[PDB]
Amino acid sequence: SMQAIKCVVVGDGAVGKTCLLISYTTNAFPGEYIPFDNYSANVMVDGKPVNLGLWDTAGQEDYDRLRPLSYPQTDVFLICFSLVSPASFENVRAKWYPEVRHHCPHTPILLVGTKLDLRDDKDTIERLRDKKLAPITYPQGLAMAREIGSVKYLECSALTQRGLKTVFDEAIRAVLG
Ligand SMILES: Nc1nc2c(ncn2[C@@H]2O[C@H](COP(=O)(O)OP(=O)(O)NP(=O)(O)O)[C@@H](O)[C@H]2O)c(=O)[nH]1
Ligand SMILES: [Cl-]
Ligand SMILES: [Mg+2]
């Protein structure tokens, strides 16, 4: 049967984990309804179809004992932060990287910056400037990726779908080659 790949997506509340999965799998960004489900996608990689199982997770502290129950048999993790939330970025090193590695010392991690569409949005830049902050830049995201031993750093927008297929393609190749 098809090569199966278990991919688990983690990161702070509101970084866009669920939208990333729905936009990727259905080719449509959620409207009013945003639903921690498992999505099943099929991907053609080097001429063979692959069964990508995608596991959504809750980012909140209340699930700190329950969430890791989904981790066994994971083939690759995506650690997500919003490019327009520096707090979510800091939490990659402070929370997500240590949690994943505590349970899965060897599983490849891809770092994904989300909400790419908002990085040069004026209202967003101004909002962040008021708190003495700025959107996370590509060099900064890449530096965090190296620091956490990630195999790849990617940026995407679930809303426009820019970079979205590449995230999951690279996820698969980190497992398969
Ligand atoms: N502009 C923009 N907004 C986005 C994008 N992806 C998600 N959002 C918005 O960000 C918010 C959170 O998205 P969501 O997918 O629910 O995040 P989450 O990471 O699943 N949160 P949780 O841990 O609570 O379940 C929603 O308002 C959603 O519309 C994106 O690419 N661009
Ligand atoms: Cl890297
Ligand atoms: Mg969600």
Swiss-Prot record:
Enzyme nomenclature, EC number: 3.6.5.2
Record PTM: (Microbial infection) Glycosylated at Tyr-33 by Photorhabdus asymbiotica toxin PAU_02230. Mono-O-GlcNAcylation by PAU_02230 inhibits downstream signaling by an impaired interaction with diverse regulator and effector proteins of Rac and leads to actin disassembly. Ubiquitinated at Lys-165 in a FBXL19-mediated manner; leading to proteasomal degradation.
Main localization, broad class: cytoplasm
Induction profile: Expression down-regulated in quiescent fibroblasts and clearly induced by serum stimulation.
Family matches, as SMART domains: RAB (SM00175), RAS (SM00173), RHO (SM00174)
Gene Ontology cellular component list: cell periphery; cytoplasmic vesicle; cytoskeleton; cytosol; endomembrane system; endoplasmic reticulum membrane; extracellular exosome; filamentous actin
Summary of activators and inhibitors of this protein: Regulated by guanine nucleotide exchange factors (GEFs) which promote the exchange of bound GDP for free GTP, GTPase activating proteins (GAPs) which increase the GTP hydrolysis activity, and GDP dissociation inhibitors which inhibit the dissociation of the nucleotide from the GTPase. Regulated by the GEF protein DOCK7.
Phenotype upon changing K165R: Reduced FBXL19-mediated ubiquitination and subsequent degradation
Cross-link type Glycyl lysine isopeptide (Lys-Gly) (interchain with G-Cter in ubiquitin), residue numbers: K165
Positions bound to GTP: 11-18, 56-60, 114-117
Catalytic activity from the UniProt record: GTP + H2O = GDP + phosphate + H(+)
A GO molecular function held by the record: G protein activity
Subcellular location: Cytoplasm; Endomembrane system; Cell projection, Lamellipodium; Cytoplasm, Perinuclear region
Its job: Plasma membrane-associated small GTPase which cycles between an active GTP-bound and inactive GDP-bound state. In active state binds to a variety of effector proteins to regulate cellular responses, such as cell spreading and the formation of actin-based protusions including lamellipodia and membrane ruffles. Promotes cell adhesion and spreading on fibrinogen in a CIB1 and alpha-IIb/beta3 integrin-mediated manner.
Family: Belongs to the small GTPase superfamily. Rho family.
NCBIfam families on file: small_GTP
Quaternary organization: Interacts with the GEF protein DOCK7, which promotes the exchange between GDP and GTP, and therefore activates it. Interacts with C1D. Interacts (via C-terminal region) with CIB1; the interaction induces their association with the cytoskeleton upon alpha-IIb/beta3 integrin-mediated adhesion. Interacts with NRBP.
Name of the protein in question: Ras-related C3 botulinum toxin substrate 3
Species for this entry: Homo sapiens
Gene: RAC3
